[PDB]
């Protein structure tokens, strides 16, 4: 019991953090791939203005 | 000749000077405004609220 009490208690922390983390890098992802669109636009605002 | 020749220059002069001087009022409304980048500097917000 008291050993499978740690155990308990390491894998709920451990899985706790790998989600927070997973979640965090997804809010990263949009952001950077928001980024990449808006730039998108402005390339393509660019691209009309020289021609 | 030279009369006729010379009262239609100064016609002429007059608008020129009206459409060309005149000009000279504002040319700067060409300059664009500032446009500025974000350099991903500007992600310093959560999911929290979204109508305001």
Known sequence: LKDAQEKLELAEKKATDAE???ASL???????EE????AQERLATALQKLE | ????????????????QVKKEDIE???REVGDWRKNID?????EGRKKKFEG
């Open chain 2, 25 to 27: 009022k504002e040319n």
């Open chain 1, 35 to 38: 980024e990449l669109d808006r």
């Open chain 2, 39 to 43: 350099a991903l500097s500007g992600m």
């Open chain 2, 1 to 16: 000749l030279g009369t006729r020749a010379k009262e239609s220059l100064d016609l002429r002069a007059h608008l020129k």
């Open chain 1, 26 to 32: 997804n809010r990263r992802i949009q952001l950077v």
């Open chain 1, 20 to 22: 927070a983390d997973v």
